[PDB]
């Protein structure tokens, strides 16, 4: 609960519970910094806290892996888990649970402060410099050095209604200058058009090193008005505190490590990116972005600039937003009526993939098949904004448990018949970043949708063809449990 | 590692030396319980287990579970299977194929004809045999008996005795000295009871159990008919299996076999047999008629050890042996064909349902081909051999990744295959008949479930690749990779 909401008490605890390794060895920022923190999520390390940066602003730090899963298999989601308030031994189950809980809790608004941490140093016009920060050069084919990979922006309607907290990448282009993506589709985007039909650029904000919670709630789909920063409240029954920037009337959380000010341009842009993305590519072309011109910057002593280095699995964007993605599509499916007893979003397919959990008896009293439960599938799934963002679905009985991949590939192996089981959608339209989407898929804006069933056809009539030959399914429960109990009297000690 | 590869005895004092079995002590039944602490012990990768005290069973009588599972240590996670072929506990996947395949090649040695050996040391003839006063285990909760064997092999020899065969098999337990099982009729125990039969006799016959490990694997070598398995233990590990004559019907088993069985395989008598829980996962409800085996005697060592094998998910025993040893054939296959394969390998996870099959792109854009073309030969090329006839699904992916470990498959199959282009159906090319996911009209067919998953992308065909990988070992120069390795423990670690 304090870790949720406060980033510098998140890195204590970490260290207190050995989840922090303290490198005081000078790294650099060129590269070193995000080749240790990418060993460290293959490896499952502990979170890097790096202590010296070369050439960096004295007393600057940098946090790798801030949700990175651990080695210990009781304990891997605690770093994730820590940014929903959850305990050390929390699993997937747990964390939906959790999830679709806080997803109908009552949001508390924000504390507001007169004062807080991250005005310890302030850095206005002038004396505002991004690059004496350790801005890292993540991947050595991005296009340049990204100053924000682990926060939120912050901007706010015209009438100052409501807020918008939304997680997006700021590359370092200039001193003051950074860019990035803006998605009109989004509450950032929508606000944008809303001060350019104004005649105006849009007062922003960045926080970095913004309580782990803020993070979390700053990737929720919501309805337009609705604010981002009352859900903090709904996560982990506690306010998140705020006080206003400097410069422009925005309201930011007090403890951040770092906030920047500015706004965003109405026309300029810079050719921003690639990096190296979620689905564990790095493509070689950049894109034009809108520019966010840094008016005002500030942060607490000794500030930890939290990134992320994304690519293959597992890092945050299959931890922290694929988990949240498996709790809302959960939540999507059970609605409206669908069979589903949980989704997993398999690390190991990069978010490329959702798996839905199908109880079997409630989906024979659908009294349907598989093409029509398939298309009814895709619809509810991909027509919601968590289901937008992948691709690929895969329905399987409730029998393998789906947060275990290993388990996953058996049941697509052994049940997904090649002339039956798979269900193109190719006129639901793409999510644009999906690696394989060629040059017609990207023109067209569809192409890449599919569900993979692996149910049997008998399933549907609430059959099954044959039993599953495991532990847990080719004994009584006497016997299993016999065996449970007794196991390391036959002399296993821990298997 | 050939004295553990060439007895079963000091195959299990080693596992022992090692840390990977466990001795249980405590008294167990027969009766599913040992199959459940085994299944568990393949799912959680235990140590085998070796059981000493079984209810109602004859004295110094011990079973062995999980002979060739895995263990949850990564670094040793395949030894058990390793010893099978000979080979040091850090063996892996790549290493054992290029063993197997440098032993496709290797010359037969002659197995070693003794006059005696330990497994005469207790001999049963005609009413003697009473099969059911060893722990004969009912295996799976749905199975339709129990199973006398799930490890182990016939010995079958032609009319002539020209040559003779080693092929596994499973054996319920129908009476007091009747077993039966399947003969697959175009295998070479099916070839040669059709060689009996039209001399209108039965087919005379023994199975050895506890046999040595590299008998067992060598029983599963790729031979043309009139070629013994035996003689390919020595291609294997470089030493001849040791044999004696059987007591009563002068066929060759190996002289250290735990259990030995003799008699004849019925020409018409059946029994129903099965379900049992099989290779793919599961146990199908219906029992079909099959063969008899009479056993007229046994013989085997003092204090016996029956090994078996609980069939299921993965990862068992049809999965670490045959399917490893799959992999090493189309490897074969696939390069002797001409195809830009430097690696094939039969996932465990999938059950031997799927072969990924890992492309060499540059050598693959030197064919000036396309997916529709490349998925269609490589189809042709692979599901008409007799290893990949046995594989129902084959992955196509570059060689960037490592087809040996599930979770990059995983994030290929997931970030590669499109869903338009890359699912090559091939309904007409005849099916292997277990794949648990046929329908009856595929059963009727012949064929229906062959597919050719492709991971290739569009690109690669012409040399390229849209994309580099975001990870440790690619978005990082070779020079700073070493750096964070040596400074390692320098940063904290």
């Not at 690929?392 to 996953?408: P, S």
């Not at 890449?448 to 495991?470: D, H, K, W």
Request: proline share 8%; aromatic share 8%.
């Amino acid at each position: 609960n304090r870790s949720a909401l406060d980033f510098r008490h998140f890195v204590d605890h970490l260290r207190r519970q050995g989840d922090l390794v303290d490198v005081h060895t000078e790294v650099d920022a060129n590269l070193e910094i995000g080749a240790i923190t990418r060993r460290v999520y293959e490896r499952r390390a502990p979170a890097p806290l790096f202590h010296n940066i070369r050439d960096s602003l004295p007393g600057a730090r940098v946090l790798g892996a801030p949700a990175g899963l651990r080695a210990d298999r009781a304990r891997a989601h605690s770093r994730l888990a820590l940014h929903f308030g959850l305990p050390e031994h929390s699993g997937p189950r747990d964390i939906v649970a959790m999830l679709r809980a806080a997803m109908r809790a009552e949001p508390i608004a924000p504390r507001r402060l007169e004062r807080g941490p991250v005005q310890e140093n302030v850095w206005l016009g002038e004396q505002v410099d991004l690059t004496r920060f350790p801005v890292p050069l993540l991947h050595e084919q991005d296009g340049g050095r990204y100053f924000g990979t682990y926060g939120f922006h912050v901007v706010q309607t015209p009438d100052g209604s409501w807020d918008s907290w939304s997680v997006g990448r700021l590359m370092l282009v200039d001193r003051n200058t950074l860019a990035g993506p803006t998605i009109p589709t989004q509450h950032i985007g929508i606000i944008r058009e809303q001060w350019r039909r104004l005649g105006k650029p849009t007062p922003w904000a960045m926080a970095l090193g913004a309580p782990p919670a803020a993070l979390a709630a700053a990737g929720m789909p919501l309805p337009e008005g609705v604010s981002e920063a009352g859900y903090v409240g709904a996560l982990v029954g506690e306010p998140v505190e705020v006080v206003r920037t400097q410069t422009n009337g925005l309201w930011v959380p007090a403890n951040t490590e770092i906030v920047l000010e500015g706004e965003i341009s109405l026309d300029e842009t810079a050719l921003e990116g690639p990096m190296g993305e979620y689905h564990g590519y790095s493509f070689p072309i950049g894109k034009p972005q809108p520019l966010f011109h840094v008016h005002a910057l500030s942060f607490r002593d000794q500030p930890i600039l939290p990134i992320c280095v994304a690519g293959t699995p597992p890092e945050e964007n299959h931890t922290i937003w694929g988990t949240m993605i498996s709790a809302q599509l959960l939540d999507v499916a059970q609605n409206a009526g669908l069979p589903v007893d949980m989704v997993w979003c398999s690390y190991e397919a990069a978010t490329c993939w959702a798996v839905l959990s199908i109880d079997v008896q409630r989906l024979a009293a659908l009294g349907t098949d598989a093409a029509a439960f398939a298309a009814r599938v895709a619809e509810t799934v991909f027509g919601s904004h968590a289901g937008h963002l992948v691709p690929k679905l895969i329905l399987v009985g409730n029998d393998i448990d789906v947060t275990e991949i290993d388990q996953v590939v058996w049941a697509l192996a052994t049940r997904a018949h090649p002339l039956h089981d798979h269900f193109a959608f190719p006129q639901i339209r793409d999510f644009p970043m999906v690696p394989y989407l060629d040059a017609e898929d990207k023109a067209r804006g569809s192409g890449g949708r599919l569900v993979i069933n692996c149910l049997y056809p008998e399933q549907f009539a609430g059959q099954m063809r044959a039993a599953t030959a495991s532990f847990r399914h080719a004994y009584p429960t006497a016997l299993r449990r016999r065996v449970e109990e007794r196991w390391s009297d036959y002399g296993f000690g821990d298997a």
